[PDB]
Amino acid sequence: LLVWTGEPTTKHFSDIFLGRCLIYTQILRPEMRDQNCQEILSTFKGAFVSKNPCDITREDYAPLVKLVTQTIPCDKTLFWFTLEDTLLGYIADDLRWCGDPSTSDMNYVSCPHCPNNPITMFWKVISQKFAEDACGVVQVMLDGSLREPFYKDSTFGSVEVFSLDPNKVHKLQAWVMHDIEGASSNACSSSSLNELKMIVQKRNMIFACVDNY
Template sequence: MPLQQGSARARQRTVLLVGIAVLLAALVLAVVLASLLTHGRHEVSPQMLKWKDRGTTKNLQEVIVGRCYNYITAQHPELGDKDCLKIWESLKDAFIYKNPCNITPEDYQPLMELASHPIPCNKSLFWSKTNDLVHRYTKSNQNFLTLEDTLLGYMADRVSWCGDPSAPGINYESCPKRNECESNPGSVFWKMASKMFAEAACGVVQVMLNGSVEAGAFRSSSIFGSIEIFNLDPDKVTEVHIWLMQNIGGPQRGLDPSALGQISASLALCCCGSISSNGAVLEPPGLGMGLRDVPQMSPCTKLSCKMHSWTPHGHHRASTSKGQWQPKFHNPHGFPAYWQTSF
């Protein structure tokens, strides 16, 4: 009897050991299979899309949130109720894990609503091909605001971002240029922000154009010529003052009659001359506005004097085809002298 009991216990131990061995073997097999499957998925996972422009700005969240807090606390405390973390989340949601060529205006709509704020009348300053000058001007003259001086523009200025369908959802290596795809995160953002900035303008609006670029001062393909000009509200905007910036010693192409016609037609405002059949600029009916004579020291000329310590001299007047006057300045340092032209 004792012998039989000992034999039974031995069989139980053997069965138990075999069972443990089988479980261990199954566990090892499961680990090996999981490792192989994970490794295989890693190898076949899609690569980050490659583009020609710079990638997402490093530490993008810290940059955006930091600029936002600086804007609403140090620069514009009246906007202190803005939620910078929500603004960041709405920006991130607009592009993360998305193909950067398939961004839509709807993606940015929550961001536009969270970051929008009123623009005081008579302060809106639009620009084209005068980026450096116009922002040096607004930094020294608080009477005007460009898009980059608003919360949206301030946060996004000189910053880039784009997503990617693969993890981690943000491409820090490269982002698409406009000529690679039109609906990229940067282009869609700036078009929407520019549209909103134009819609908010009221009173007298200023426009700073570069009269020395080969393509001409007014280009219908620019953001100003294709977006902003069409979204100025004629019920709110009373005048548009155009400042032509010219390089002395360089080409001075100015604003030709056809460009004036484009601006006039696009604005649908009585602020610019119309174009007759022979190409001459005509006075708008009942306004008596055309090319105005400008004081010798226009606002931009004063800025140039302050920054570069030179005084315009050799001032003379040159008659236009209409018998009106435009000021010209001689600058011994070769720094641009400026014309302010009001229509």
């Protein structure tokens, strides 16, 4: 097949997939029991199977996004009830997978490490959705270590911060995390946070920032 340099699709993917999906919709989040995990898996594989692992689009996962009806706690959404707490996020967490043109299965030999691959594209899409589903007061944890804690070039300032619905979400709250080691100055007064700030305000939303240890 196509030779790659990156790790292969996680051995036993489908099982690990359905297994996690079942534990989620049936016991952890019982209000989602009516979600068909087989259907969800198939709709997932369709996004990349029989395709080049470096030619995956955001549209390949669109159906997946339409299929899953996610339960969303309002004031608990937190960017960085996290994304890994949603059905899809809890499933693909730490898993690898890709396809191959010359097959209708998943590549267990090797996968890419080419910015439009199965893995990278999946997380971007479910992140955008997650944002769109946010309700009330949304949070976001920012690294107080970095110079520019907030940077558009991230999935956050790129699409996440712009996919937040003002009608449902009325306030964005940025958490600038710091270490006891280091005189981490108040980054909430820097530009990155002043920009992230204007963006949110310019979108009829209240912005709050805090510096914690």
